[PDB]
Structures are given as structure tokens and as C-alpha cells.
């Protein structure tokens, strides 16, 4: 796996009380971190995952996604 996976594992825990379908995000992030080489590659992929998703799984993805980007 990539060093991307670690930053993604940190993100999982922090947004965990906010995100519904944490298990689903957990399977998605387990997939993408083995596919993407950069954290920026994980971000843009999750910007598609959001579009492909529907609420509240679209709310799940955006919370972790943004948190990676570190947008205030």
C-alpha cells in the first residue's frame, strides 16, 4: 500500500463521528489507497466518488475528502 493510506486512516478516525456509512467509506478508502500513488490522487478520485454517490453516502465522502484537503 501507499503512504497515502496512512493520511487516509487518520482522516477515517477524525471524521468517524460525522460520517454515516463509515463501513462503506472504509471499503472505498481501502480500495483507492492501493490504487493511488499521491494523497492529491486520492482527493481527485474522491471528488468523483462523491458525484457517483448519493446522500448520505455523498455526505460521508465529502467530510473525509475536504478534511484531507485541510480546507478551513
Automatic annotation (TrEMBL):
Residues 22-49 form a coiled coil. Keywords: Coiled coil. It comes from the Archaea. This is Uncharacterized protein. It comes from Pyrococcus furiosus COM1.
Amino acid at each position: 500500500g501507499s503512504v497515502v493510506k496512512e493520511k487516509l486512516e487518520k482522516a477515517l478516525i477524525e471524521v468517524r463521528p460525522y460520517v454515516e456509512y463509515y463501513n462503506e467509506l472504509k471499503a472505498l478508502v481501502s480500495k483507492i489507497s492501493s490504487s493511488v500513488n499521491d494523497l492529491e490522487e486520492a482527493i481527485v478520485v474522491l471528488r468523483e466518488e462523491e458525484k457517483k454517490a448519493s446522500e448520505p453516502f455523498k455526505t460521508d465522502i465529502r467530510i473525509l475528502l475536504d478534511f484531507l484537503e485541510s480546507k478551513p
